[PDB]
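explain this:
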Amino acid sequence: VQTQDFKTAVQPDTNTAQLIKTYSNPKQRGDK
């Protein structure tokens, strides 16, 4: 997966979030 540019209160960048994204939404762009 791709890390987000900055962390946000509503969507922080966490390891479990990326693990979930590996199958829920892999082709996601971290650009903001």
Q: What stands out?
A: Residues 5 and 31 are 6 Å apart (CA to CA). The first helix runs from residue 15 to 24. The helical segments are 15-24.
